[model samples]
Target: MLSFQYPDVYRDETAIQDYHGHKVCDPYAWLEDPDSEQTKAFVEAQNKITVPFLEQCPIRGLYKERMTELYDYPKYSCHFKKGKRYFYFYNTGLQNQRVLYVQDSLEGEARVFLDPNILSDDGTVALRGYAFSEDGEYFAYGLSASGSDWVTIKFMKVDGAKELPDVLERVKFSCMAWTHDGKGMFYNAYPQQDGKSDGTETSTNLHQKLYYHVLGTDQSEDILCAEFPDEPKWMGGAELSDDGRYVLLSIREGCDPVNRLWYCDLQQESNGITGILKWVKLIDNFEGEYDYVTNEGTVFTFKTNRHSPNYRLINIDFTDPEESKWKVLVPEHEKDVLEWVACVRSNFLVLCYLHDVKNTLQLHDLATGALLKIFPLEVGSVVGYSGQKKDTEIFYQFTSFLSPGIIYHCDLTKEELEPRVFREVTVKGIDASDYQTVQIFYPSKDGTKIPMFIVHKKGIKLDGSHPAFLYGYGGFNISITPNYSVSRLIFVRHMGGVLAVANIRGGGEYGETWHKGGILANKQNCFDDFQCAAEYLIKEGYTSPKRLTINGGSNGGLLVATCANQRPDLFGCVIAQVGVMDMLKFHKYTIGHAWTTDYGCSDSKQHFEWLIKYSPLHNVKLPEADDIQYPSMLLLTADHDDRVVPLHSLKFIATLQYIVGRSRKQNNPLLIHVDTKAGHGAGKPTAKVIEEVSDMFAFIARCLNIDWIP
Candidate 1:
C-alpha cells in the first residue's frame, strides 16, 4: 500500500463571495496572489512533496536517458527562397535551438544566417517570428525570453548579415509586415508595460496599437499608424499587398472566428505617411473571419467563413464596399474544411483542406477557382510550407505519428506536377516498421461518432492488462492533427503503452458546427464524449480503468480535469497541465477575456449556472457509493505562464488538498509540479522538454505499477 503525505495549507476562513444570489466560498483565493510571501512558501511546500516523490522512482532516470537518445535526431524545415537566396532552419541533434541557414542555390554551401543558441547561455531565448522584406534587402525577427509571448523585434540587413541598431518592445500577439519600398515596416504592440517586462507578472494586457518603424529611427520616434480608442479589447494586425499599394488591417474582438476588416490605400495618401493615416472600414462587424489573400488593383480576394461554415474564397471590390457586391471565387466544400490558402506562381493558388481529419493539398486557378491538380498525400498533416506568388517552386514538410518529417519540393511550371522528396529526417536506433498507427471512430454519449488515432507496437495484444495513455484538447476550434512526438513514441516502444488522441467535438475537425457543439451549454458534451471514449477502450478490452492515464493541457487541461471529476473510475492517473481551472475568475487574468468566446462569461447569470456545474475548482467532491476515489494526479504548471497563469493550478491544487486530501477514500497522491522560468509550453529548450516528459512518464508508470521493458 502506497500512502502519500500532503502539505497542510492555511485556508482563509472568510474568503466567500456572492455570485448572482449564490454564495460560494473560495478558501484558497489567497493563492491567486502569486508574488506574495505566503504564495511562494506554498509553492515551495508543494514542490517539496512532489520532487521527492518523483526522485524516489528509479524509472525516472531510465526514462530521461531513453528520451534523450530518441530526441537526438537531425531536423530540417522546408526551404524557402527570398530574392536569389534560399533559407531553411536546421538543428544538428540535441542543439537547444534550430539555426537558420542561407544558401545562394539549392546545391550551394549554406552559411549560418541567425543562430538563436548564442542569444542566451541557457537557450531560454527563442526566435518567435521573422519576416523578409519584399525586395529581400532587410530582415526583421522577433525574439522572446523564457517562453513568454512578449516579443522584441530586431532588424538586420540580409547582405552581410549586418545587425541594425533599431529595436521595438512591448509586443505580443502581433504580426510583422514590410512595405515594398523597404524603408519602413508595420507591427502591432501594446502600451509601455509597468516596471519589468518579464513574463512572471500576472497583469492584464490591453490597448494595443499599430505603429510604423523607419529603418534607422529609434522606437520612441516611430509613427503611430492606427489605434482603436473606443474598443480597448480589440487587437489589430497589418498586412501589405504584394504590389505594396494597400495595407489591410484585420481587427479581432476575441478568440472567436470573426474579425473586423479595415484598409488603408497608401497610394492615395496625398499628404504622405508623415501625416495622419486615413483608414476605410470595410467589414465593421464581427460576422465572420476575413483573411486577406491577395489583390488585383482595387479588387481584393479574401478567405472567409461567412454563410459557409467550411469557408470559401471571395472577391471584394473596394470601390463598391458592399456585402452584395462580394463575388464567390471558390464555393465552400460540403464535407471538407479549407484549412488555409497560399497564392503561388502569380496566377495560381495552393489550397490545403482537412478531409476527414487528414490534410489534402490542391492547386487551383486564381482567376476561375477551378481545380488544376490534386497532389497525392499520405494520411498525415502538412506541418509546414513555403511559397510565393512569384516563385515557380514550392516546398512543404509532412509528418505523421511514425515519421519525423519529410520535406517535398514541387514545381508549378511542370506539365505534370510531381512532388519529390527534398529532405527526409531520420533518427538513429528507431525503426518505423516496429510500430503501427490506426484511426477508428468511437461512439460518444450522444451517439455521435468521434474520431481517434491510436499508436502502439505492431504486435501488441488488445488485452485488458495493458496500460494505456490517452490525450485530448477539445476547445477553441483548434484541430488535433497527427504529428511526430518523441515522448509519445517512447511510451509505446519502451513501456509497451498505447497512445490515443481523441478528435472530439469543440475542434475544427468537422468545421464550425463541430466547434459550436462542444461550447457553452454544449460544453458538457466535450466531457461526455471523452468519458465515453475511455469506456469504449475498456469495453473493447484495450485497457481497464486502473491501467489508463489521461492527459491534456490548457483548454484540454480543462477537459481532463472535468472528466476526471465526473468519472473518477475511468482513469488511474491524471495529468492536467496549465489548465483553466477557475472558470468564474479566468477573465480577470491576462488574455483570459479572449477565451470567453468559447467559455461563456461568468458574469452572465445563465453562463454562471453552466460553469459552476463543471468548473474544476468548485466541483471537487468525495466519491459516491458507486464511484471510485479520485485518481492519482500530477498537475504541471509554470511560474511564467501568464497566458493561463499558474494561479489556476495553485488555487485548484490547494482546494483539492483541502477537500479531497482529508478523505480516507483518497489513497492516491495529489501533487502539483511548478516549473520555474517557463511559460505555457512554447519556445521551451529541448533539455527542459525531455526532463518534464521523463518525470511525467515516471509518475504515471509508478502509479499504474507497470513494468518497464527497457
Candidate 2:
C-alpha cells in the first residue's frame, strides 16, 4: 500500500474566535458551508486519498461477500396491534429495506402492507415513522430520503389500500397519533422556511408546532393545535389521549427528557374541534422527567423521575391537579432503577428495570400497583417490547452478544402460562454455539463497578495473542444494550478477536443517577471509565496495546477520540464515527444545542472551560514532540449528517492533518471516509451498511495484524 498524502487544506488561522473569554481557532471554518466550492474540493481531496488507501485491503471483497452472506436472513419485527389487525416489519433475506407487513391475527397469513424499497431503487427513501388509526381505518407514515432526519408524512386508507392526498412536511423528530374517530391525526412539524423549503434539514430546527391533519385534505387545511411562537427554541408535539377525549401536548427546550406537558380537552364547549385548541397545563416545569404512560379520566399515570432520580410510577389525579397530592402508585426501588413501564392485558403492567445494567421485567397490576410475576430473562437487553394497554397478548424481543435475538409471546388471558417462544432467529451457515458471552464488572478510575460484556470463543485463552475490540458510548441518556452484530461475529470468527462492549457512566442503564455520574462536569468520568476498561483488558492478558482497537460513534465517537488522544500508547487503532469533535461551537449547529443537557454549552463561562478541556478539534496536537507512537485512526462522518454536522469532522481532520501531516513518522495514518447520499447512519441501505462494515473490519483487521481467513 502507498503511503498517505496530506490533503492540501486551506487554513484561515485568523478565524480564531472567543468563546466566553477564551479564544479557539477554527482554521477550516469555511468547510462548514457544504455547498461551497472549497468544501466540495476538500471532500474530493480526502476521498481521493482514502478511496485508494482502503483499496489496499486485498480481502475487501471477501469481507463484503461474507458480510452479505451473514446479512441475508429473514428478519422479522415484533408484532404490534391496532384494533384486530397486526402489523410488523420484515426483510426476507437481502432486501435493501424492511417491508411493513400486516395480518388479521397471529395465525393468519401476512401480506405486504408497505414496501419502502419500492420508493427508491437504491433504497435511500425510508419509512421514518408510521401510526395506524385507533379503529385501524387509516395509516399515516413518515418518509425520509438519503437517511436524512427530515420527514414528509402522508396518509392512506387501510381498507381500500389507497394513498390519500394529504402530505405534512417539515417533520423531524416527530410522531403521529390518530384520534378515536380516525378522521384526523396529530403530528409535529417546523414551519416552512421562506414559505417553501420544507426539505431544509441543515437549518436550525426550532419553533416546532403541533398540527392536526384532517383526512383527505391539503396540508394548508391542517389545524395548528399548539406552539410557542415567542419561544422559538422550544419544540412541541401533540398526541391523543387513550379515549381520544383530549390532545396531549409536550413542549421541550431541548433534547433532554424533561418536558412540560399540556392537555386540550377535545370534549370542548364548541362541540367541534377547530383552530387552536385550548391548553391546560399539566406539568408546567421542566424540573424532572415525566413520561406519560396512560390515564383514566382525570387520574394520569407516568413513569417519572419527579422527586426520584431512579424513577417511579405515579398516579396524578387532575381533580386535585397539584404535585403535592400526586399519589405514588409504585415508589422508587431502593436498589433497582425503573427504565420502562408498559401497560398491557387491560390492567397489567410490564415494568422493565435495569438492575446492575441488566434488564429485568416484572409484571404488575396497573390498578393496584401490585407485583404479579417476574419474567425470567438472561443477561441481555429488552430491545423490543411490542404491546398495547388493551391487548390480550404481548410480544417482546431479547438479545445478547452470542444470540441474535428471540421474540417471546405471552398470552395474558392465560395467566397460568409462561411466555412462549414465538420466533427464534437462526443465522444460516453460522452457529451461535461456537461463541459464548460473559458479563464482567471492571472498576473504573473512580472505583465505579462498570459492567462490560466480553464475548469470545468458549475456550480461548487470555494470552495477549488475541486481537481485542473495545466499544463504548458513555454520553446522552441512551443505554448501550447487548445485541448481536454480524460484523463483530465476522471479526470473532475470521480475525479470532475478543469483543467487549462497556456500559460506562452517562447512560440510562441505571437510570438518571448513572447518567448524572458522567455528564457535564462529570464527563471526564466517561473517558476515565473507558480508559480503565482498556487497562483491564490488557491487565487480564486478553490483549496488548499493539493488538487492541477502540470503537464508538456519535457521543461515543467523542469518547474514543478523547481516550485515544489522552492515552496514545494504549491502543493499536481508533475508530470514531460522526463524533461531536468541536465541543465549543457544537451548540451553534442544528439541534446540537439540545445536547447541552449533557454536554454543557460554551455560552457560559463555567461550561466553556468544561468543553474546551477535551474538545477534539481544539485539543488535537501532533505526536511528534513526545514520540507518542500514536494509534492508527479512522474518523468516519457523512455529508448530509445535519444532526452533528459534517463540519465538526471536516474542521477536525484538517487541524489534525495540519499537525500530524501525511508522513508515517509515527507509523500511524489518520483518515476519514465520508459517504454521500447518507446522513448519521439511520435508514442507510443494506448495500451501504455492508460496504462500510466491510471497510471498517478490513481496516481494523489489518491494523491488528490479522489476515483474511477462508
Candidate 3:
C-alpha cells in the first residue's frame, strides 16, 4: 500500500563526489585549516556515518522512557505557599545547578533547600536569579560566571543563620523583587558610565535602571524607571505589594513586543531620602508583556494582545493609577486560545489554551469573568506549569511522541478532574492508536487561511504517491504547535511518509497580527506562506511535484532555503536545517545583530532593495528562461554553529555547487552535512539524538530515492 522504488541507495559515485566536495569547500576551511588531514578526514567521515546510524535507532529507548516519565527529569523551577513551605528549582545534567527545593504539602516530598552550586567553583556557580523575602526569612541569591554575563548579588538567612559578606560584583541584575520586611530588594541594573570603555563596541551602551538593594546597607539607589540602549531589554513584570506600599513595573519595549504599566512609590522621599521611588504609567498599549506574578494587591496579572490574537487575562489596580483601574479577567475571545497566564491567587487564574496544539487546562475567575473548569490533558505537551494557590492545586509536565513523559497533580477542586499520575511510562509495545492526526486549511499567498498539521497513518491515501514530508518554521513569532513525536512516529508515520506541519505566517499561530504578517520587510509573507503550503499539498491530491519533500530549521532554515530557490519546479526534495542562508550578510554576523528584530537589515537602502530580492544566499537562480530541473537538496550545517554561521551553510552550499555545476540538468541532488558535534541545536546526548535522527532519515532516503527498508 506504500510504494516508491529507486533503491541501490541511489548509486554512490564516491558518496556523490563527497557530498559535492563538502559543498564547495572553504567553510572557513574547517575553521581555518584546523591541522587539515583533509580536515581530519572529513571529521572522521561524519563520525563514521553518524555514529552507527545513531546506534540502530529505536528512539533511544523512547528517549530514556521519556526521561523516566518526567518525574526524575522533573527538571526545575517551583514555588508554592500554603502554611509556608515549598520552593523549588532542580536540574540534573551532571554537576548540580539551581537545586534548592523544600516541599511540605500538595503531596509533599522534596528537601534540599540550597545548593547554589554548593558555593562556587565548577566554573563559578551559575544560577542567575532567585528571591523569597516576604517574611520567608531572606534568600536573595543570584550568581554567574560559568557563562558569565555579569550578576553576583547574594544574601542568605533562611535558617543557615545570616550570610551576606558584601557581594554585588560586576552587576547587570534583572527583575529580582522582594521586600516585605525581609528588609530590601527590588533589582534591575545596567548603569555603567564611569569612564566607560570595555570594548566589543562598548557593549551596546548599557542603560536599564530601577534599583534598591539594601540589606546590610551599602544603600544602592537609582529608580529612573525606563530607558534602553546597551541592548538587552525586558524589565516587565517586577512586583512588590503585600503591604510594602506598591511597586509593580512591567515596561518592556522592543525585544518584548511592547508593554507599559509602571507604578512605583514605596513611600517616596527623594532629598532627605526615606524610601524614594516614584513612577506611574499603569498599562498603556500593552500588546503583550507582563510576566510576573506574586499574589497580593496593588493587584497585577497580565498577558495581553489587546483584544485577541490569542492572549487575554488582565488585571491591574496600582491603587487607582487611572485607566479606570483596568480589569478584564480573561475577555478577548475569538475562539479563545489564551496563553501562559498563571496568577494562581487573589481570585485564581491559571491558564493555557490552544486545543489545537493540545494544552487545555483553564480556570479563570479574577473577580467575575467566570469560566472555572476545563482540564482536558491526556498529555502531549504541557511541559511545566507549577502549583499550589489555595487548593486549586497544580503542577504539570506531560509528553508525547510515543508517550513517555508524565507528572501531574492537578486538583481543580475535584469533581471528576482526574490528573493524579505522578510518573508512569513503560513503553514495551507502544500503541497510541498507531498514529494519525489531521487539521487542514491551506491557501496562503494573500488568500490567507493557512493552518496545516497532517501526521499520517490511518489508511493513508489521497493519491499522488505517498512520500510527502513538508514542514515549516516561518519565523520568530514561533507557533507550529502539536507536540509529541516518537521520532516523528518512527520516520514519518512508521515509514509510510506524509508528515506535514506548515502553520505559516511567521508563527505565533495567528497572533501578533500573524506575527506582524511574517516579520520585518514582511519577509515575503514567510515565503508566500510556505509556497501556499506546497501548492495546497499539490492541489489537494495529497502529494505531487514528484513526491514532494521539504523541511526547515533555524528561521525555518530560512524557509526551506527560500523555498528551494523559488520553487525549483515545486520541490522533490529540500531540507535546510540550521539555515539562515545569508540574507545579504545577515547584519554582519555574531548574533546577526540580534536578528534585526526578526530579519530586515540589509544595511537599509530600502533594505538593500528588499534584501537583494529574496536573498537565499543572494537569490540562487538557473532554473529559468528555458533551463529547468532544480529540486534535490540537503544543506545542513553545524561545525559549532555559533547560531546560523556555518558561513551561511558554507556560502549557500558553495553557490549551490556553482548552480549545480553549470547545470544542463546535472543530476540535481546537491548535498552537504557538516555537524561537527552540533551547536545551534543538538546537544545533550542520547547518542546525539540518534545522530540527528539518522542524518535526517539519511537525507530523506537519499533525496527520495528511498532504500533502507525494514
Candidate 4:
C-alpha cells in the first residue's frame, strides 16, 4: 500500500462566527452544501484516496466471501395477518432486499406478494412503509429511492397485486393509516420544495400536514385533514383506534419522549372527510408520551409516561375528557420499563418490558390489568412482533448475540399458554455454540454501573492481546438491544476478536432515568461512560488501547467522535459514520431540529454552552493538545444521507485532516468514504451491506495489525 497522504484543500478561514458570546472558526463550512461543485470535488478527492487503501487490503476479498457465505441465510420477519392472508418479509439467501410474501395459513405455502428488487436495477429503491386496508382488499405501500426518508406512496390490489395509479409525494417522517371503509387513507407529508425532493438536499423539514387520500384519486386531490399551521416544526401522524371509532393524530415538536394527541370521532364527520376533520384535543401538552392502545366505546386505554418514568397504561374517558377523572389500568413497574403494549384477542394486553436490557413478554387482562401469563424467553430481545386485537395467536421474533433469530408463535387460547418455535434461522456453516455472550455491569466515571454485553469465543484468553471492537450509541432514547449481525459475528469468529456493546447513558435501556443521565446538561456522561467502557475492557485484560477499535454511526457516530477527541489514547482505530458533528448548526438541516430534545439547541445560551463544549466538529484536539495522536480514522457517509446529511462527515473530515493530519506526529491513516446513490444506513441493499461490512473489517484488520485467522 502507498504511504498515507491526505488531499490538500483550500479552507475558508474567514468563516468565523459567533455563538452567543464565543467566536468559533469554521474553515470547512463550505462543505455543507450538497450541490456545490467544490463539495462534490472534495468527495471525489477523498474517495480517490480512501477506496484504494481499502482495495489494497489483502483479506478484503476473504472477508467479503465469508461474509457472503454467512449472510446467505433465509431470513423471515414476523407474520402479519390482514383479513384471511398472512403477510411477511422474507429473503431466500442473499436477496438484495427482502420480498414481501403472503400465505393462506400459518403452515401454508408462501408466495411473493411484493418484490422491491424489481423497482431499481441496483436495488436502491426500497419499500419504506406499507399498510393494508381494513378488509385487506387494497394495499398502500411507500417507496423510497437511495435510502432517503422521503417516500412516495403507491396503491395495489391485494387479489392480483395489480398496481394503481394513485401516488403521494413529499412524504417523510410519515405514517400510513387506512380507514375502516377501505375507500380512503390518512398520511403525513410536507409541502413540495422548489429545489429538490431527492435525498441529497440539506433543507430542514417543516410543517408536516396530514392528508386523506381517496382510493383512485391523484395526490393533488387528497384532502388536507389536519395541519399545524401555527407551529411549523410540529410533525404529525394518523392512526385508527382498534374499533375504528376515532382517528388518532399524534403530534410532536421534537424527538423528546412526549407528544400532543388529538382524536377525531369519525361518527361525527357527516361530510365524509371532504374538508378538515374536526379534532378534539386529548393530550395537548408535551409533558409526557401518550400512545393510544385500544378503546371501548368512549373509554380509551393509553400507554403513557405522564407521571411514570418507566411508562404505564391508563384509561381516559372521551366523554369526560378530564385529567382528574382518568384512571390507571396498569401501573408502572418499579424495576422494569413498559416497552410496549399490544391488545390481542379483543380483551388481552400483551406487554413487553425491558428488564435490565433483556426483554420479557407478559399477557394481561386489558380491562382489569391483571397478569394472565408470563411467556418464558431467553436472554435476548424481541425484535419484531405481529398481533391484532382480534387474533388469538401472536408471533414475535427474538434474537441475541449468538442466535441469528427465532420466530415464535404463541396461542392465547390454549389451556397452557405456550410459545412454540415457529421458525429458527440458521447460517450455513456458522456454529453459534462456538461463541459465548456474557452481560456485565461496569462502573462509569460517575460510579454508575452501566450495562454492556461482551461476545467472543467461549474460552478465549483475556490477556489484553486480542483485538476488541467496542460499539456505543448514547442518544435519542433508543435502546441498543441484541439483534444478530453477521459482520459482528464474523469479527468474533474469524479475527479472534472480542465484540462489546456498551449500554451507555442517553438510551432507554433502563427507561427515562438512563436516557436523562446522558442528554442535555449531562451529555458529557455519554462520553465518560463510553471512555470508561474502553478503560474497563483494557483494565480487565479484554483488550489494550492499541488493539481496540471503536465503532458507532449516526448518534453513536457522535459518541465515537466525542470520545475520540476527549481521549484519543483510549482507542487504536475509529469508525464514525454519518455522525452529527456540527452540533451547533445541526438544527438548520432536515429533521435535525427534532433532536433538540436530547441535544439542546445552540440558539439557547445554556444549550450552546453544553453543545460547544463537546461538539465533534469544534472540539478536534490539535497534536500539541496531547502527546498522543488521534487514532487511525475511517469516516463513512453517503451522498444521499440527508438525515444527518453527508455535510456533517464532510466538514468534520476536512477539519480533522487540516488540524490533525497535517502534523508530523500524526501518521495513522485518516480517510473518508462516500457512497453515491446511498442515504443513511436504512434500506441499503444486501450487496451494499456486504461490501461495506467487508471494507470495514478489512480496514480494522489493516489498522489494528490483526491477521486473518481462517
Top-TM-score structure, candidate number: 4
lDDT scores in order:
0.88, 0.83, 0.61, 0.90
Question: What ranges in model 4 sit over 4 Å off?
Answer: 625-627
Clashes of each: 0, 0, 9, 0
Error of 3 at 708 (Å): 32
Candidate ordering by lDDT (highest first): 4, 1, 2, 3
TM-score for each predicted model, relative to the true structure: 0.98, 0.97, 0.31, 0.99
Q: Write the per-residue lDDT of candidate 4 for residues 114-200, one digit (tens) a residue.
A: 999998999899999899998878999999899899999999998878998898889888889999988899999998787888998
Worst 10 residues of 1 by lDDT: 1-10
For each of the candidates, the C-alpha root-mean-square deviation to the true structure, in angstroms, is 1.4, 1.7, 24.0, 1.2
* Model 1 misplacement above 4 A: 1-4
Query: Which model is ahead, 2 or 3, in terms of lDDT?
Result: 2
Q: What lDDT tens digits, residue by residue, belong to model 3 across residues 477-570?
A: 6777766555555555334677788888867765567777887778898898888888888887778876788888888988888888887888
**C-alpha RMSD between model 1 and the true structure:** 1.4
Tens-digit lDDT string for candidate 2 (543-611): 999899999999999999888778888999899998989898788767887899998888889988888
Model 3 TM-score (2 dp): 0.31
Error (Å) of candidate 4 at residue 168 is 0.7
Tens digit per residue, CA lDDT, model 1, 40-129: 999999998888888777888888999999888888999999988999999898888899999999999999999999998878899999
TM-score order of candidates, top first: 4, 1, 2, 3
